C-alpha cells in the first residue's frame, strides 16, 4: 500500500500545481507595468553602532522604532538607542554561539538562541536593576535559527531540527510543535495579527503555519536552494523569501504561489536577510556580497544599493514606523540607513 | 542633554566593559574539534581535563584552549560551520581501527571558510589498528592499496591519504598517531597551535 500512498501524494501535488497554475491569469509585472518607478533610492548611513567585537548574526527593532537589540558571537546582546547611538543594555550570554535574537513588542523581554539549542528569555525590566534570564526554553534538538515574540508570554521559535515550536514562557513548555519541514528551518516571520506565521527551511520550501491550530495551512516551493530569510508583506497577505540561490521571491498567501522574483545577472551571493518597507513598496534584501539591495517590490527592479559593509550583512530590519532600516554585518558593525 | 548625560555615561561604562571582555576573550585559543562518530573525540576531550555544542576549556603552558565539540549537532554543517571560521585550528580525530572520515576531512579542509585554517589531525586507536592488521588486511578498506601489510606502512598510507585531501598552500595538516593510552595529546596540540600562531602572526604582518 506504500506505492499507492506515494502515487496519491504525487497526484495530489499535481492537483495542487494545476490549481495554482489555473489562478495565474496575469502576473504581477503585467499588472504593475503602469505605475511610476520609485527611481533611485539614496539611503545614507545616519548612525553606526560600534559596540560588537565579533560577527553580528541577528538584530531586531523595538516596537517604539528606537530600541534595537543585536546579537554577536562575542557572547553579548546589546540593546541600542538608535537615535543617540547610546547603549542601554549589554547582556552577557551563557553560550556565545548565538544566531538569533528577538525584541518583545512590549519591550520588556529579549529572546536569544543559537547553537546551544536553547532559547533564552531575558527580563529587561527586572526590579533588581540588571537584566536576568527569566526563562531558558530547552526543547529543541537542533540549533535555534529564529525566534519571534507573539506577546510577553508566548514565543515561536525555529530550529535546525526541522521543527518550529510555540512556547509558553511562564511554564517553559512547547504549547505547540509545528512539524513538516524536511530540512533545517532557517527563517521565521510572524504575521501582523500574529494569528499565523511563515517559516523558510533548507528544503527550499516555505510553509504557512498558524499558531492557534498548529497545522501547515499552505506550502510554497519555488526556490532552488536553502531559504535564509522570510518576511511578511505589511498587509499580511503576502511574503518575501530570500534564498541562497541569490534570488528573493514574492509569494501570495491567497493566490498560493509566487508573484515576482528579484534576481539580477550580476548577483550570485545568496540572500541573508529580507525586509519590507512600511508601505511594502520596497523590498530590502541583505546579501553575502557585502551589500544590501533595495528592490521595487512591484516593479521587481533595483531602486538602490545599501553598500558600506565590509563583510556579509547578516541581518536587516525596518522600523515599525518605516523611518529607518538597520543592517548588521559580519564586520561587527550595525549601521542605520535613512 | 538633561539626564541623557547620565545615559551617555552609562553607555560609556558598558562600552568599556565590552572592550575589556573582548580583550580578555582574544587571549583564548579556539579549536574546533571534528571527526566521525566514536572516532576518539571523546577520548581526547576526556583525557585533557574537563547539548548542542560542548565547550571544553583548559590551560596548557600559559595558553587557554577553548575546544568546541560540535558533534551533537545532527544537522548540516553549512548552516552553522561559518560560526567557527575564526578558530585557530581544526582538531580532526580519525579512528584507525574502524571513507566517511575521508569525505568529512575533504569537505572540511576544502571549505570556503577554512581555506587558511590548519587542521591538527589525530589518528587514534593505533594499537587496535595494529591488532586488526594482525587479524585483517588493510586492503579491505582501500582497494587501490598496494604494499606491505605491516602496521607502519599501512598507517603511513592512511596518513598520506588524509594529507592528500587539502589543496591550499597556506595551511598545514599536523598528523599525530595516538594509542589512547597516552597523555601527550595536549603537547601535540600545543606545539601545532604554536606553529599556527606564529604563521598567522607572520601573515598578519605581511611577512609570510
Amino acid at each position, epitope marked *: 500500500e506504500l506505492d499507492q500512498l506515494r502515487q496519491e501524494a504525487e497526484q495530489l501535488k499535481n492537483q495542487i500545481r494545476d490549481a495554482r497554475k489555473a489562478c495565474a491569469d496575469a502576473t504581477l509585472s503585467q499588472i504593475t507595468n503602469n505605475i511610476d518607478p520609485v527611481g533611485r533610492i539614496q539611503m545614507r548611513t545616519r548612525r553606526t553602532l560600534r559596540g560588537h567585537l565579533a560577527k553580528i548574526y541577528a538584530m531586531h527593532w523595538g516596537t517604539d522604532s528606537r530600541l534595537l537589540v543585536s546579537a554577536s558571537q562575542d557572547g553579548k546582546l546589546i540593546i541600542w538607542d538608535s537615535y543617540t547611538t547610546n547603549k*542601554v543594555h549589554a547582556i552577557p550570554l551563557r553560550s556565545s554561539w548565538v544566531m538569533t535574537c528577538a525584541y518583545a513588542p512590549s519591550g520588556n523581554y529579549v529572546a536569544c538562541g543559537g547553537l546551544d539549542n536553547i532559547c533564552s528569555i531575558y527580563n529587561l525590566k527586572t526590579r533588581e*536593576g540588571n537584566v536576568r534570564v527569566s526563562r531558558e526554553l530547552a526543547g529543541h534538538t537542533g540549533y535555534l535559527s529564529c525566534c519571534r515574540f507573539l506577546d510577553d508570554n508566548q514565543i515561536v521559535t525555529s530550529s535546525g531540527d526541522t521543527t518550529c515550536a510555540l512556547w509558553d514562557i511562564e511554564t517553559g513548555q512547547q504549547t505547540t510543535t509545528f512539524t513538516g519541514h524536511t530540512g533545517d528551518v532557517m527563517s521565521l516571520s510572524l504575521a501582523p495579527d500574529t494569528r499565523l506565521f511563515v517559516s523558510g527551511a533548507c528544503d527550499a520550501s516555505a510553509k504557512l503555519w498558524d499558531v492557534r491550530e498548529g497545522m501547515c495551512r499552505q506550502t510554497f516551493t519555488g526556490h532552488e536552494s536553502d531559504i535564509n530569510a522570510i518576511c511578511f508583506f505589511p498587509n499580511g497577505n503576502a511574503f518575501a523569501t530570500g534564498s541562497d540561490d541569490a534570488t528573493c521571491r514574492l509569494f501570495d498567501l491567497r493566490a498560493d504561489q509566487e508573484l515576482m522574483t528579484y534576481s539580477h545577472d550580476n548577483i550570485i551571493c545568496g540572500i541573508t536577510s529580507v525586509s519590507f518597507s512600511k508601505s511594502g513598496r520596497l523590498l530590502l534584501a541583505g546579501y553575502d556580497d557585502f551589500n544590501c539591495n533595495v528592490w521595487d517590490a512591484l516593479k521587481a527592479d533595483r531602486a538602490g544599493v545599501l553598500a558600506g559593509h565590509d563583510n556579509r550583512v547578516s541581518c536587516l530590519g525596518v522600523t515599525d514606523d518605516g523611518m529607518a532600516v538597520a543592517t548588521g554585518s559580519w564586520d561587527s558593525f550595525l549601521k542605520i540607513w535613512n | 542633554s538633561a539626564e541623557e548625560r*547620565a545615559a551617555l555615561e552609562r553607555s560609556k561604562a558598558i562600552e568599556k566593559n565590552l572592550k575589556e571582555d573582548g580583550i580578555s576573550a582574544a587571549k583564548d585559543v579556539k579549536l574546533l574539534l571534528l571527526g566521525a562518530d566514536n572516532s576518539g573525540k571523546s577520548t581526547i576531550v576526556k583525557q585533557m581535563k574537563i547539548t548542542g555544542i560542548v565547550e571544553t576549556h583548559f590551560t596548557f603552558k600559559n595558553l587557554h584552549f577553548r575546544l568546541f565539540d560540535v558533534g551533537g549537532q545532527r544537522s548540516e554543517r553549512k548552516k552553522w560551520i561559518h560560526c567557527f571560521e575564526d578558530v585557530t585550528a581544526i582538531i580532526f580525530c580519525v579512528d584507525l581501527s574502524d571513507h566517511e572520515s575521508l569525505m568529512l576531512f575533504d569537505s572540511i579542509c576544502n571549505n570556503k571558510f577554512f581555506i587558511d585554517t590548519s587542521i591538527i589531525l589525530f589518528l587514534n586507536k593505533k594499537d587496535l589498528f595494529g591488532e586488526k592488521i594482525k587479524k585483517s588486511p588493510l586492503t579491505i578498506c582501500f582497494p587501490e592499496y598496494t604494499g606491505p601489510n605491516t602496521y607502519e606502512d599501512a598507517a603511513a598510507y592512511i596518513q598520506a591519504q588524509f594529507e592528500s585531501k587539502n589543496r591550499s598552500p597556506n595551511k598545514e595538516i599536523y598528523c599525530h598517531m595516538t594509542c589512547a593510552t597516552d597523555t601527550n595529546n595536549a603537547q601535540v596540540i600545543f606545539d601545532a597551535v604554536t606553529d599556527i600562531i606564529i604563521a598567522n602572526n607572520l601573515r598578519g604582518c605581511g611577512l609570510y
Partner: single-chain antibody
Amino acid sequence: DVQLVESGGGLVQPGGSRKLSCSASGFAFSSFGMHWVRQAPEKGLEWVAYISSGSGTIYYADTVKGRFTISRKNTLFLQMTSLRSEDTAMYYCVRSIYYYGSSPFDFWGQGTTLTVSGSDIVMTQATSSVPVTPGESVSISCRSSKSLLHSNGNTYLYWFLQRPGQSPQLLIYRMSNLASGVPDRFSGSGSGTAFTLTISRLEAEDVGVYYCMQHLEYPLTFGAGTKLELK
C-alpha cells in the same frame, strides 16, 4: 527584595561632623545612581547630593557643596562637615538608574532623623492643602520657572507621594509616565511650565503630601508639597 536601609542619624553638636551609611540589598547597587534627599521636620524635600554609577559625576546642592561628600559592599556614604542648625532633617537614600526609558527615583530608603542642636529652577505648588473625600477626583498642580521640556521631547517633572509616616514613593516620572506598582488611577499632565497630577477615584491609601521635582538640571528642585488630607 529591594531594600535601602540607612543609619547614622542622631543628636550632633553644631559645627561637628557625621557620616551616614546607606546599606543596599536586593538590587544591583553598582549600576544605579544614588541620591541623598533630606526633609526638614516642618518643610518639604530638598535634594542634597548625587553620585553616579561608577562614581563618575557627583553633584551637591548650593547649601551642601564643600561641607558634604557623597561616596559609594553595596553601601553609599554622606560625609558631612560643619553641620549648621539648618542641616537637621531626615535623610533619604534614593536609587536613580539612568538609561533610555528608565524610571529614576523609583525606590527610596527608610530615612534617618539627624537632629542637630540663584539660577536654579524654582518650582512652586501654589496650593499647600486640599480638603477631599474618598471616591472624588483631586487634581494637584505645580509650576516651574523654566520650561522643563527638552529638545528631545521629554519633560522632566517627577511626582512623589509621601504618605504620613512613610518614605516618598515615585508616582509619575517625566510628567506623564506612571511608575511601577502605582495604580492606574494616578495621571500626570502638563505643558512646558505648568503641570497637573490628576487622581481619580481617590482612596484612603492616597492621602499624603505630593511633591513635584524637576530633573532637567542639577540641583534638582522639589516643590513645597501639596498636602491632601482626608475629609
